[PDB]
Amino acid sequence: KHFKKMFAGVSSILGISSREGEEVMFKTPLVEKEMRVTLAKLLAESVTEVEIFGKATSIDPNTYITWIDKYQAQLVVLSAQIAWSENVETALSSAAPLHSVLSNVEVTLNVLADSVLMEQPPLRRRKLEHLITELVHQRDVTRSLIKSKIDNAKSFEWLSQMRFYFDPKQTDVLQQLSIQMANAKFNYGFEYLGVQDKLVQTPLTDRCYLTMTQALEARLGGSPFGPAGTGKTESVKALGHQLGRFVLVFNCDETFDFQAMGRIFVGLCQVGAWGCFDEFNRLEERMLSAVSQQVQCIQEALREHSNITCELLNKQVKVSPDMAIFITMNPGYAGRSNLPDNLKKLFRSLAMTKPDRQLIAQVMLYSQGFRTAEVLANKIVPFFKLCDEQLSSQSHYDFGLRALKSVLVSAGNVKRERIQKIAENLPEQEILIQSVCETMVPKLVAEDIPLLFSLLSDVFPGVQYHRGEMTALREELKKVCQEMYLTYGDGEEVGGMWVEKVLQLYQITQINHGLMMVGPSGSGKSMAWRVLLKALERLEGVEGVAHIIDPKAISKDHLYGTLDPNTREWTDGLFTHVLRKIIDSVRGELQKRQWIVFDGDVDPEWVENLNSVLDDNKLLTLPNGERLSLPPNVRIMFEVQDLKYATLATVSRCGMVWFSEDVLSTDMIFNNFLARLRSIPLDEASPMLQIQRDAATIMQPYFTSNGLVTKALEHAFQLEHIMDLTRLRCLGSLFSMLHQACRNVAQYNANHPDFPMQIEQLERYIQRYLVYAILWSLSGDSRLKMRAELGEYIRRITTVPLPTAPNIPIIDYEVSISGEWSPWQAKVPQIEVETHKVAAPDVVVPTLDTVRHEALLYTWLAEHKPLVLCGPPGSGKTMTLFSALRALPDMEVVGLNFSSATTPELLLKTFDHYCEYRRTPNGVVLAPVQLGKWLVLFCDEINLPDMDKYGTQRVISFIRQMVEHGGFYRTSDQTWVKLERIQFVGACNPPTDPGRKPLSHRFLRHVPVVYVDYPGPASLTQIYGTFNRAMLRLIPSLRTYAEPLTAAMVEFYTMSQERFTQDTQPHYIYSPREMTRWVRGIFEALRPLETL
Amino acid sequence: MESLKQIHFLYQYSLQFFLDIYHNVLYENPNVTDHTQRLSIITKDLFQVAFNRVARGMLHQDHITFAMLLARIKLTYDAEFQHFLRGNGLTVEQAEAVVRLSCLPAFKDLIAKVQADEQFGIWLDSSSPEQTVPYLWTPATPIGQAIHRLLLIQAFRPDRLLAMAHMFVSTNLGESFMSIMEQPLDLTHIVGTEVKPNTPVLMCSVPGYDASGHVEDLAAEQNTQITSIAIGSAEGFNQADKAINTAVKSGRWVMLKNVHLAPGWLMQLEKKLHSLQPHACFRLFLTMEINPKVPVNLLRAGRIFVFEPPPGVKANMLRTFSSIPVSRICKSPNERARLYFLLAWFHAIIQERLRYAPLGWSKKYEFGESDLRSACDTVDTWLDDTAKGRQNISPDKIPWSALKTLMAQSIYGGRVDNEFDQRLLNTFLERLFTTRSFDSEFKLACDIQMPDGIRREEFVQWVELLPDTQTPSWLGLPNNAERVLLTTQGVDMISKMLKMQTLHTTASNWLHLIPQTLSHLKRIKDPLFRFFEREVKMGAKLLQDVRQDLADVVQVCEGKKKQTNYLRTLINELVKGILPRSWSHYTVPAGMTVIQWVSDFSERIKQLQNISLAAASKELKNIHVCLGGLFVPEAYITATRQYVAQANSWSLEELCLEVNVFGVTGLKLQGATCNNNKLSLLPLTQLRWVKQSVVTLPVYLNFTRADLIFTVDFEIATKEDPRSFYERGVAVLCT
């Protein structure tokens, strides 16, 4: 196993195996030296064998094919440059022989292009496609040489090509072969590179090889740059292949210390390997100079060798001459740093800003077996350019060279599948349309789909495609979807768009190793991949395992792991341990389909550490030199909202699936809610189930098509709130309130066992509860005037009976269990507080706002769902919440405050103090210390966690992970910990207040928010008149002055609040707690005198 | 001297160096034993050394600010001297300066004397009016006449305000006063006598250049060991501490690179060193980048030098010839010197082309002495391979093609990304590096004669035989490219000398009128109509967003509450004039302020109103638009191409474009003019998508030339060279 990660890219070690399957054997019956001598003697035989028919005027198919099958992938291609270069050197030394060599190349290309039209095994087919790629390079270079007249080998036009010299008389078999270039003279490494994947040798890529060949002839490094996804790392790999030394690819992040690159350079030097460092735009500015020191010091010893030891981490160690360093930047993007100027002095820089898409689209498509690949490429490349230029400016599109390579490999897969389904002619223009529909169509928004299909109709006239159906998977989705109370569609029904998106996601998953989702919150991403995984596990019989990691909430050291600087010790992170357990296969994880999902938002500091696992040769690097080869059967996924803060270095690597908000309409949410209500009992046929089913039968007419709830909801988006309204939160709050309605009916049946609930009264209760719940779920987080306007609209829509009060809004009514309206003035009697409780903590003067809010908070805390209370300072969120809790003798509170520099460690310490851990067969459960007694976490300031650079708080992400999955990851043992009896209630001031930021929608979906406003002159006068009457009992003679005193202060507080506010100073906060201090002062002044 | 820290923010001045001026002048200045002549020598040399000590540690564009002030110190003219520092077919902008100068008694003749002379028109259009100036005002001294014609030339041609300053200093302080700046830096002498121990050698680097190699070259030159440790790591910090202690003990050379990255340890070094008494000839070198991070105390202490691309074509060849050692350039064959001179000349051309950007090279690529060093190594290797064992080689046997390819692709062309810049580099390398370069009458530019030597010695005197009257025509770029920069320097003189000598109310008035200027926009498978509807949709949406934002600003400024978050941010970006990110949804030039945004937006909304009228009325083919006023001109081009393809049932690939002078208006052409489709060195453009000695000119939305969108094939007049149109920089501009 360990050879997969350090020694080249072979699989395991009689001979050396490989991932694709081809195995070498030892000639002679010390890992490095033996396998190089074996390879050299093989090439010595191969050159002599191929020079027999080097003048390939007529080629025997049998001998040629068995020569392909006899030898290895790297040797055949290499021996196809050796013979070429010797033949052309002989011809140009003596233009008839040059034309003869061109004809030989053409004949060889024709015989190899005839083979792909016949069925071939993939093992030979990969080598044969590589040979087509090489021989197209040969034919294009030879026709370039003949196009511009040349006379001798000393002309630069021949001199600047990858010419391969073979010396049969060389005793040193390792020095038997050489390669030349403009001023260069190398020796081929003869490492068992293996097959890998040979590139297309375009003119831009030709400049790319030439500049670094010149750099490496001298003692410098190579620094490709430019926009991402143009072939930098793969170009360095191409140099490694063409010069015979495997290049170690290292992705670089801020986690590196100087000691890590110290051992990287020591490891490179002690064996004589090559390094390709992917990132020097995020490795820290000072650290760039700190490593410039070392990379400058090594080059001096290299030049001394050119005219042996060097210092590396204060140690004199030997340096082999066969060493090379190449780098890569991705300059110009926002989320990156600059470079020191001295580093650039050591490095040659070449720009990849326009790769030749035409010839790469041509040659490999032609090698796959397409008869008319020329016209197909000529039509598809400008289609890509047109798509790039004309489509709308969406930050999540990716039409670079990676997208083209994926599209054409998908076309090859489609061709193979259609051949197996059915020889000489199979409409090839339709194959590209099918590939584009499989890969490119899913990631478009609904606006741009007609544009893309118009392009497909224009640049590819005719050959109109008919969408296929995977009826087996679709019926499996029928059988699995209904189990979890989810709706299904036929592609044209109300739920067809969503299932079509699931099928598109399956298609992207089959071809793209890296997968990703984008769309607004609450459009069905999680449910979609969950049902897809369950259906896949039920269909193929392979167990489906899903891991979820939220990377934004977790610190980067805990997520990826971190090296201990005092003594180099590698503590693993989350993803590191996940990969270690999959690779080690302790339980049998290699035989199971295992997905890793990354929910949460995107941020460049962590997504781009995965750039080394989403490329070819998928492999993760760590600072300690430990390397992890990625499993074949796993898939790395993202479930994110938007990409307003992501770069194209990772947005292009991963196949994409886009969900619009209209994919998941309202009717399917209604159907899911009603199915869950009918089937699963609320308390956990029972009486609860009967009540649920009766209520669902009552309410079904209101939860379909337009009805009432949808009319109300689309009328509500024209009314402002504290913050941006979302549909799915607005429906979840309603669903919880309806669950409480069912519980209340159960309470009523418990009150009268001899008189069960009657249906005729049950309707009068439940339609009334529906209108009340619609009101408080759609206008909970809004002003009172918004509540009045929505009350009027809800009155107009529906026939639910309503109060006859001419000027009382419907929001100000209670729905009685008797099944009728009641004013809220019945539950707020004028009470007189005691003499010693005139002004005390935890005292509530009842008013209609307070009792209404108490009822609502009771309803949401009864179901044990999270909650948020937000309004201007002084509204009474704290005391109202505590009053709601005081009526509930089953939950206690833990006060908790978030600072602007707070961390999840605050909540972790609170849990360690107030809760405990225990290991159950189900896993790890975090339990409150009091059994059966609910433990609430009150967060007095929820909207001021630490605000990250890219618009996503950390603690908000942590609470989101708490709420959605009911748990988190404990980093001491990096394990899954789930909550038992903890619900989260929070409070804030409005985000429009100055220092407070707006709250993320993906977390705002889970939690409902209620607006609590300061009472104002209507209720403050009553409250503090009650306090003044209770306070002027210390002095009996002053009781007549209680009323005119209250009207005074309440006026002045009204006169002073409008004048002084935050516009002048930051802390000009006016609250009714100023009135609390008022009455406290007057009471504590009038208490002991007894006569004024 | 001291009060320049309020201008540069890079040079910090102390009393110790000003007393070092006396320590050098009064004890080491050569000379006579006569008091009056000695006083004259000391006074004359004080200004020279005061400029020489200072100007080596500051930017070139300020070298004229300090020296001209030193012309005042040595300098009755103060009454009229303040006029040009506080005063602010003739054109209006020149007429304003003329009338403002006419207020002085000394320039009362400007009222009538400007029209009597018929040679004034020729003088105004002259290539260099600094040499001769008409006098318009008791015979005056040469200094007084210089001041008078300084005021006059600013009043007439402010673009030539800078150049006159250079001669005015020579009127007072001497012709050879500034000549030592245009020479290589004598590092060895300065470290020999002008830099004491306990005084770090500060080396500032403008971005794109450095001075790390200079100290290593010095260390190899003097045959001394040196310890070099960079800045940025704790291990490096400790090794640097050990190195500085050992060097203090033993007198060794110590070298620190990029100390601007760690101001803590750097601030510690000043107090570590000032309280220390080290060995003789102990020198620490610090290299840094110009930024407001380095501790000011360390700048007060050390010896500051500024390293950058030197001005002028002349100085670059001296710097290059000093950089290459004498032995290498004189090695056989004798044509090696010829190729070295050609390489140095080409390097000077490209590096001075960078300065006049974007008109010469659109992207400011970085080019330094590493590129020149690698090119020289390549030339040496090629000549070793070609001319082994021979003393004389012919021009034809020189590998011209290989050298041209390698300079065009790897060494210098690797940093070139745009295709147009690559083809321009090819144009240079083909024009200069050829067998014609060895003819006696070869021309480097069109005039300048190449020297006809064979050794390094005779080339040297010709470099400084080049006249100081330099114009961009030496490069190929039009001379008018000076007018953008020279004026930018002229206003840099008056401003930098002047330092040397509620919000709601504003915003409410600012946005009372802006709604009045702006307007309102009214909203099957036709390729033109779909993209036009998308354009109108985006325009209407963003216009509504802007209108709502401005309404909110008006309401919060008037006092109608709305004291919210994200509106005070708009107040800040509206008062400061920075374009907020809430509105930058398409490409605009950097630094483009809000008033220009509204001026552009009004015309854009008017155009989209006309588009809506045309679409509502099809007639969408005969509508005329101006590119740049469209959010995505690429979309318009693609829609036109697809409309033609669908009209004629052609494949979208097989449809190329031809241009004639579909209607496109509002375009502009810079650098040339055209009448009959032949470009002579655009009221309406006709575009015809046709099936299947011209020049490919680009089109850019903004004058910055960031990203290209479109190319046009244009014919050329018979009297002009196709290659020169790449050099000159003719371009199509949408603004």
Ligand SMILES: Nc1ncnc2c1ncn2[C@@H]1O[C@H](COP(=O)(O)OP(=O)(O)OP(=O)(O)O)[C@@H](O)[C@H]1O
């Ligand atoms: N096709 C569907 N039909 C009905 N209800 C659905 C469907 N898909 C999802 N839901 C319901 O929508 C709610 C959220 O769905 P899901 O978790 O899949 O959303 P999401 O897109 O992953 O969310 P987010 O992006 O906000 O984290 C759950 O009630 C789920 O049952």
Ligand SMILES: Nc1ncnc2c1ncn2[C@@H]1O[C@H](COP(=O)(O)OP(=O)(O)O)[C@@H](O)[C@H]1O
């Ligand atoms: N010449 C080429 N031949 C084959 N594939 C190429 C070639 N150039 C680029 N590609 C493809 O384009 C992608 C470029 O990836 P990479 O160079 O790593 O981008 P970046 O340098 O931005 O990380 C690769 O997936 C590669 O397969």
Ligand SMILES: Nc1ncnc2c1ncn2[C@@H]1O[C@H](COP(=O)(O)OP(=O)(O)O)[C@@H](O)[C@H]1O
């Ligand atoms: N409706 C009300 N009835 C009685 N007292 C109230 C009411 N609203 C506010 N108060 C009093 O004024 C205080 C307002 O401050 P409060 O909103 O509780 O602080 P916070 O800013 O932490 O939410 C309350 O604590 C309470 O003592």
